[PDB]
Write a protein that binds this DNA or RNA. Structure first.
Lengths: 110, 98, 79, 52, 230, 98, 79
DNA sequence: CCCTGGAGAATCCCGGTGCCGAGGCCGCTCAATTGGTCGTAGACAGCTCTAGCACCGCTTAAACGCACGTACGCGCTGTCCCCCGCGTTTTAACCGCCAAGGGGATTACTCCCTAGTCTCCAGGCACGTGTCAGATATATACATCCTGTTCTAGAGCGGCCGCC
DNA sequence: GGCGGCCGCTCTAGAACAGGATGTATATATCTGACACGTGCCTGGAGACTAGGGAGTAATCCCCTTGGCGGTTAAAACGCGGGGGACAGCGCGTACGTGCGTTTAAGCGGTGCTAGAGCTGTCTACGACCAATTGAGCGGCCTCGGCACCGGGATTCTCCAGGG
């Protein structure tokens, strides 16, 4: 399954798609920035593609790895949950939060 | 001072009775006529339609859409629902084979 | 001719559903039936286009509209 | 139908394959929508909400 | 024949266990008794035995950031004189030397390090509009040609930290977290916000880069537009 | 011991996959054959039916009932249900015009 | 011939529902499906009865069943 | 919270216009009506012969019925965000009216392949038969679902410690 | 000396993981039963011919739909107020999923026979076609009247406010 909407900045351009993922990305809207002149061969997979059908969810499934990750990474537990959720999230452009839109009624989303 | 403030549904039922007993066509001719030419221009250019040709096309389009709307209505009350939904229309097309 | 699918206005669809006995109409219904009407119009007119081109005629007659609707089991009386 | 015959490891055309070939094609499905095929069955499709 | 005949605890064996599958039976010959079907199968088996506030000047900073990025076509100046490490160090030393020392320095430095690595690992995953993605790309390749691992902490400005603070409620509500840790993070966030309030003049200086060398912002070029939004 | 005790619904999809890929006739031939004779007895007392004539009637009725059951089934998910009801069948016949 | 509407047994109706993708089968659908099947059979066979009388035949052939099903838009392949 | 009296606005019956579409009339003309004449499809009589109606044995997979329980149907509550009723200002719809020029409808000259045969012959159909993929069958083997055991957070509880 | 706060101990348990279970996917052995090749015709279309008639083309004509306007009152659309209902959620339950005991007829194979559809003659009225004729359907015009339109009035079913 492939899409032509590219749900990382809501724009259009050169697209790449994954086999088992229905989300499209540009060559720049990724955590590793890749050029088409030296694109990797074989299958391309997203970050949560690496988190769903690959390690931490197929073998050594996410039972309590957040807590032992907290124990391993010298007690950053007030931020370690966000560090864990970074890996289980696709890269995307910055979007303004909803509660910033209400305080300024003069600006509307394009 | 107090406005009438009709509750929703009663005027909707009243509009049902007023239009089911009516004869005249609800959709205006000019918006429907321009839609026919726009669709036909994607198939064959420089195509004209007669006044009675659009008139025959408009009457069949309303009756087909009304019959779909009746089937959409009884599908809603089958689902213990009052308001029709877009998924109800998709259900009606599949069952009808269209 | 562009953006002609908006010719079928929102209360015009509401009036059609009032003829069908529909109590309440969702806001997403109007966008759905416009595609349904476009699909239905894209079949009858295309069939009428073949009827018009077969007779070496440049204008689609009401006779060809009736025959286009008749072959799909939706025959129209009164032309 | 020959492509559908290779799907279930068959080298002989069976009316099950003919029904599978007709319904799989988008153009052929609505053309023979009012057509009944004997000894063909239906497509083996399950709704998403039916699976546990 | 019969109804109950088994050597073990019987279950109405007929010479077949009723209510059980066919391929579970045994046909060996042993001492079989009835005992009223083990006294009615042993008495029938022993009788079933999140809101965050941001000051309006800071919200103005984010919305004019958005204006400069998307409408005015201005991207952030990479060789800025102030980096986020300097901001966090000034934060930590200023709030350590302002108040007393009752033990707040431990979780203060803990929050500083956690925010440092969060900003390291969240620079290009929630933040960074498509316009500056190739900026980040050229930072990574200009560091890869130098055989040095590039960190965002040493080169980026605090405006992206403000962006991360703005989208912090979305990340917090999307994760399962403890209540006390969430309120502690909120309190530290508000403390950082009032610290940015009192130092608002010397940190975010409003300058036009059309006539000044340093304005914590540079302008988009034509090839930049063509490769970014093309 | 303790039986396997398949959960309610697991065998339902197992029978769904089996009958959707195999073309055997679910209805027994003789009960359907004698039903045809008693229906045709009201129209003609001295009537006979060929072996292939009853054969042709059975598959047409089997496919019509399955197609009706298909329209009956997706009406349940439209009604937030998984169980077919007689009101779903009357919904299907009215929409189809039968 | 009497009591022949019960020839379509309870597992026979259940097997038809399994072919149609039905997951759960109600106990009141067996009487409803029998009535629908009887109504459908009362139209196809009666149409085939009129085809049989017009052909000067006293036995219903499979060819007349195809003709009876064809005019109702339910044409059967394989006879 | 439910029952009942008074009034705002959409709706229904009615008096008067008249008007534009319907009812009846004038021919006549083109399709409907009258009589004969055959090729020809059809009703009728006798033969038959291959498939259906009726009954038998069994046997066995299909089906009626009872016990148990958990996915699901149905009853009840909130809610809020999705849709209706109405004020207001545009907005395009249709009758009013005008050219127009491609185009539907009608008439005639003429041209080719289809109406209708003769003959035959090479493709098409009925029959006979070697044959090659499907089904039965069973140990072996997938294959996912259900269930039993377990591994470490989450919350409650209790012991320890500092402060007033 | 008593009490709130903090951290360790222990019970609870969510849900991934491994093993048993039963119905199918495959691995041959072998039957088997139609599948397609070959043969022998034999019946239907192709080369070739006779004659002709309905459309392609040309011309006319008159007709009719598109473009293109002001106008104006009907209404689409925006927005405010608000209102009742789809859906999330929870709880009751009974009734249909699952499992098999037990009866019961579907079906395979076999027998006999007549109910009757092709098949072949036979003879017989019947409808397309050809002369001959002819009579009201219809284009169009004169007349005329049923209800759209315009208001007037009215009962009449509905909502808001007051009382028990």
């Amino acid at each position: 399954e492939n899409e032509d909407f590219c749900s990382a900045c809501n724009q259009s351009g050169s697209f790449l798609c994954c086999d088992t993922c229905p989300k499209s990305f540009h060559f720049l809207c990724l955590d590793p920035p890749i050029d088409p002149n030296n694109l990797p061969k074989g299958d391309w997979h997203c970050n949560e593609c690496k988190f769903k059908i690959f390690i931490n969810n197929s073998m050594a499934t996410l039972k309590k790895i957040e807590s032992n990750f907290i124990k391993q990474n010298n007690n950053v537990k007030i931020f370690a949950k966000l560090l864990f959720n970074i890996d289980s999230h696709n890269p995307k452009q910055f979007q303004l939060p909803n509660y910033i839109k209400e305080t300024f009624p003069a600006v509307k989303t394009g | 001072k107090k406005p009438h403030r009709y509750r929703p549904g009663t005027v909707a039922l009243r509009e049902i009775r007023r239009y089911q007993k009516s004869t005249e066509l609800l959709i205006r001719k000019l918006p429907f006529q321009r839609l026919v030419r726009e669709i036909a221009q994607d198939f064959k250019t420089d195509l004209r339609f007669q006044s009675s040709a659009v008139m025959a096309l408009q009457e069949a389009s309303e009756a087909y859409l009304v019959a779909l709307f009746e089937d959409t209505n009884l599908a809603a009350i089958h689902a213990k629902r009052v308001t029709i939904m877009p998924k109800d229309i998709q259900l009606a097309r599949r069952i009808r084979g269209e | 001719l562009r953006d002609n699918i908006q010719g079928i206005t929102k209360p015009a669809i509401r009036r059609l559903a009032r003829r069908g006995g529909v109590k309440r109409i969702s806001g997403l219904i109007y966008e759905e039936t416009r595609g349904v009407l476009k699909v239905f119009l894209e079949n009858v007119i295309r069939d009428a286009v073949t009827y018009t081109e077969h007779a070496k005629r440049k204008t689609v007659t009401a006779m060809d509209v009736v025959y286009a609707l008749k072959r799909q089991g939706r025959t129209l009386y009164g032309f | 139908a020959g492509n559908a015959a290779r799907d279930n490891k068959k080298t002989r055309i069976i009316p099950r394959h003919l029904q599978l070939a007709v319904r799989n094609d988008e153009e052929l499905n609505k053309l023979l929508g009012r057509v009944t095929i004997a000894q063909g069955g239906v497509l083996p499709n399950i709704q998403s909400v039916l699976l546990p | 024949g019969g109804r109950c005949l088994a050597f073990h605890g019987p279950l109405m064996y007929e010479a077949h266990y009723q209510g059980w599958k066919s391929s579970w039976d045994e046909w060996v010959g042993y001492d079989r008794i009835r005992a009223y079907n083990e006294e009615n199968i042993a008495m029938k088996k022993r009788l079933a035995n999140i809101s965050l506030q941001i000051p309006i000047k800071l919200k103005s900073v984010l919305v004019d950031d958005w204006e400069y990025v998307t409408k005015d076509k201005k991207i952030c100046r990479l060789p800025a004189d102030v980096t986020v490490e300097m901001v966090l160090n000034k934060y930590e030393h200023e709030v350590s030397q302002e108040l007393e020392s009752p033990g707040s320095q431990s979780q203060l430095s803990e929050y500083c390090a956690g925010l440092k690595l969060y900003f390291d690992k969240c620079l290009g995953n929630m933040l960074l509009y498509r316009l500056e993605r190739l900026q980040y790309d050229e930072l990574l390749k200009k560091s890869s040609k130098d055989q040095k691992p590039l960190v965002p902490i040493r080169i980026y400005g605090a405006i992206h930290l403000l962006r991360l603070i703005s989208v912090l409620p979305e990340l917090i509500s999307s994760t399962t977290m403890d209540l006390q840790s969430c309120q502690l993070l909120i309190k530290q966030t508000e403390d950082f916000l009032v610290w940015l309030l009192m130092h608002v003049d010397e940190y975010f200086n409003d300058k036009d880069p059309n006539r000044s060398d340093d304005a914590l912002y540079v302008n988009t070029s034509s090839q930049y537009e063509g490769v970014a939004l093309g």
